[PDB]
Amino acid sequence: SDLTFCEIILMEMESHDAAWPFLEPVNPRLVSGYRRIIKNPMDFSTMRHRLSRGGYTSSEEFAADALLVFDNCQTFNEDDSEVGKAGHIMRRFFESRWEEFY
């Protein structure tokens, strides 16, 4: 049940218009400095893969990964960049849907 809400929220983030930067891992070969700056990469397919495996104990671990996506985004991208702007939309989406359950 704690993971049935995570399925709902992850499904809704995956299909969100602003999700396009976060659907697959950043490729550090294409992004100068990414590997140096982002210690713990995270993205939605990685969360999906881990949810399919059953690798989440509670919903808080799920939220930890979600929040990590948007912490990384705000660490690497300017708030007015195209990726930064998408990340703010996705972050506010996640925080609001999360509170709409817990």
User: What residues line the site for ligand GI0 (CB under 6 A)?
Assistant: 20-23, 26, 31, 73, 76-77, 83
Instruction: Name the minimum Å distance from CB 21 to ligand GI0.
Output: 3
State which residue, 25 or 55, has the beta carbon closest to ligand GI0: 25
Instruction: Name the minimum Å distance from CB 1 to ligand GI0.
Output: 30
State which residue, 58 or 75, has the beta carbon closest to ligand GI0: 75
Evaluated on CA atoms 17, 48, 88, 20, the torsion sign reads negative
CA separation for the pair 70, 83 (Å, rounded): 10
State which residue, 80 or 100, has the beta carbon closest to ligand GI0: 80
Instruction: Name the minimum Å distance from CB 94 to ligand GI0.
Output: 14
**Cβ-contact 73, 84 below 8 angstroms:** yes
CA separation for the pair 16, 40 (Å, rounded): 23
State which residue, 6 or 42, has the beta carbon closest to ligand GI0: 42
C-alpha dihedral, 42 to 46 to 47 to 48, nearest 10°: 160
